[PDB]
């Protein structure tokens, strides 16, 4: 997260870190055994780290639970990043508590201008890299489809939305992928991609989770 702020430990209790011996993507806990992340974060060897704040220090509250299933959307296209959503089933249910909590899925899509909280342990620099220890947060608005498509012509599918700040300086960034964009208490987005991070006129692009709620529910129900 570039231009964000330290969330505060466990203030984003649905935020998970996907760890493969390092944090590589975020995710969002949507029930005790399932995490939503980005399809492009798929890999083997995912350990979901819940309850994290400093991802480099065992501070307490962590639950590390291996992914037992990582379900990339069947229509994920790694070039276009359409359908950039993945469900991770935890090998065991996380113990939900105030610091490890699921985030609701949308019941409807979010509207432009809704403010969302985007969080993650991604790079905090728009140039160069600095990976934070603690979870960073960014309040960011959903942009209009027109602005999103203007920023990324031909690249924004119906399953994507832009959020953030066209003036630059505030964005999700590498390492945030897969993590939440929560708006009005609903996981409306998954950090997916963007041109750089926090670049002027290049807002973050996010998987539009509301398009996948049924898929999520059906996939969870069947797994």
């Amino acid at each position: 997260i570039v231009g964000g702020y330290t969330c505060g430990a466990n203030t984003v209790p649905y935020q998970v870190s996907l760890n493969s011996g390092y944090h590589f993507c975020g995710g969002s806990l949507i029930n005790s055994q399932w995490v939503v992340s980005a399809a492009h974060c798929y890999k083997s060897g995912i350990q979901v780290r819940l309850g994290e704040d400093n991802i480099n220090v065992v501070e307490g509250n962590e639950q590390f639970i291996s992914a037992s299933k990582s379900i990339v959307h069947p229509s994920y296209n790694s070039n276009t990043l359409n359908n950039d959503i993945m469900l991770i089933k935890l090998k065991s249910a996380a113990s939900l508590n105030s610091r490890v909590a699921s985030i609701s899925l949308p019941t409807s899509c979010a509207s432009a201008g809704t403010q969302c909280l985007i969080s993650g342990w991604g790079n905090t620099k728009s140039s160069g890299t600095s990976y934070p220890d603690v979870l960073k947060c960014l309040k960011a608005p959903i942009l209009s489809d027109s602005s999103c498509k203007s920023a990324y012509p031909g690249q924004i599918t119906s399953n994507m939305f832009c959020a953030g700040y066209l003036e630059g300086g505030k964005d999700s960034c590498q390492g945030d992928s897969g993590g939440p964009v929560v708006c009005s208490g609903k996981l409306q987005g998954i950090v997916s991609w963007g041109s750089g991070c926090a670049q002027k006129n290049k807002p973050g692009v996010y998987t539009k989770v509301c398009n996948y709620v049924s898929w999520i529910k059906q996939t969870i129900a069947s797994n």
Binding site: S172, D176, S177, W193, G194
Partner: peptide
């Protein structure tokens, strides 16, 4: 690029 570590560009 995707916002993963590493980015997929």
């Amino acid at each position: 690029c995707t916002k993963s570590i590493p980015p997929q560009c």
